[PDB]
Design a protein around this ligand. Structure first.
Ligand SMILES: NC(=O)[C@H]1CCC(=O)N([C@@H]2CCCc3ccccc32)C1
Ligand SMILES: [Zn+2]
Length: 139
């Protein structure tokens, strides 16, 4: 589980969004596993605006933050699961690291701020849904 709180927005994995998120929906994209909903209070996270390929992510299944190298956002095949059939997920970045389904929502950050959240995993890999192209999150 996990979310990014920037301004009056809440960014979560779309497969983990709640009633309030859908009711106060701002934007969603199934092909990116992302959902943004409006909030009453202001958040304090800063979104990174950069091309960094190194950062640190939180792994809840290990209670540990791991430094990682990650690929650029891409269209990657994601095997079928209980939340989606087999499909290509867009704006996805992979790293070699531990990831379990309950790890989705864990933040990936660089020196510039939040890069994205855990979305995929298994086979000794971990995938992150990029949020750095979502410029409207800053306004
Ligand atoms: N974005 C998606 O299509 C995800 C939906 C929920 C979900 O569990 N996953 C995968 C399943 C395989 C193991 C695994 C480990 C860690 C994180 C995520 C997953 C894919
Ligand atoms: Zn950066």
């Amino acid at each position: 589980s996990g979310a990014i709180y920037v301004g009056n927005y809440r960014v979560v994995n779309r497969h983990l969004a709640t009633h309030n998120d859908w009711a106060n929906l701002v934007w969603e994209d199934s092909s990116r596993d992302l959902l943004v909903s409006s909030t009453t209070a202001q958040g304090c996270d800063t979104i990174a605006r950069c091309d960094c390929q190194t950062g640190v992510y939180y792994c809840s299944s290990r209670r540990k933050h791991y430094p990682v190298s990650f690929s650029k956002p891409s269209l990657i095949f994601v095997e079928a699961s209980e939340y989606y059939p087999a499909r290509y997920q867009s704006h996805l970045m992979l790293a070699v690291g531990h990831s379990e389904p309950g790890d989705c929502g864990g933040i990936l950050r660089c020196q510039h701020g939040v890069v994205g959240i855990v979305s995929t995993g298994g086979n000794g890999l971990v995938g992150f849904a990029d949020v750095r192209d979502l410029l409207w999150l800053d306004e």
